[PDB]
């Protein structure tokens with residue numbers, strides 16, 4: 001007990017060296033595995049029931065998982081770096097008092113573009129991706145809520161709607177986008193842009209930065225309205241066997257030197273205030289990472305949709321198959 005840790009997380013987030021460092025420091029073996037979406041993570045936790053000590057839901061999955069008895073309370077007294085978290089990302093209605101989730105990574109989705117291949121001024125909004133000239137060229141995120149977010153935004157509906165008529169209208173709108181779609185990728189989304197398989201599509205800010213670090217000219221065009229904002233938080237599954245190890249890993253990732261060093265490698269913003277303050281000006285004011293104020297004001301954080309989540313999934317699965 002607590003000699004190992006079963007950690008299930010998003011791809012891109014933890015460099016291999018970081019896990020080696022954790023094991024070096026604690027003597028705790030990490031059995032690490034990754035996922036590309038909340039929907040894949042969730043389906044896995046439902047099938048297995050137990051088997052994981054840590055999982056990383058986006059904030060729009062936290063309330064659902066708590067209500068379904070899938071999570072357990074996190075002890076803040078075991079997290080010496082809880083004080084380092086930015087208060088602006090804490091104590092939200094999805095998890096009052098952060099009893100079930102700890103802010104870990106926040107990011108945004110815009111339009112990824114290869115500037116050596118295509119023109120920046122030719123795209124300003126999500127709806128521009130529907131243009132006929134993009135036939136068989138786009139990458140979309142492999143994420144039901146993000147893909148529906150862009151169509152709902154295009155239609156002038158809330159990207160967090162629970163209205164089945166609006167969800168169906170977004171599905172019909174997305175069917176018109178499908179001739180422009182080459183791939184759906186949320187696993188290693190920087191890789192199609194790096195390989196030149198795609199020059200345009202949806203892209204996370206972190207993924208675009210990683211592509212730039214490898215020498216590719218991958219920028220982010222921030223849609224004028226409807227830019228997606230999201231946050232991933234760490235949670236402890238209800239059946240966790242290694243609770244002490246789980247808190248040790250959360251605290252290790254909250255450690256400002258770790259959160260800052262990792263942010264510089266993966267290209268994502270951090271909700272750890274102390275770590276954010278350690279970031280160089282070049283990273284902190286990178287326009288493809290941190291959206292301008294107008295983009296923030298006209299964008300939307302991904303929020304829970306309650307039982308309508310099944311409807312988003314059903315239609316997104318239909319889009320991917322047909």
Ligand SMILES: NCCCNCCCN
Nearest residue numbers: 010011012058143146230
């Ligand atoms: N590797 C980046 C993970 C982003 N997870 C949150 C996605 C929310 N739609």
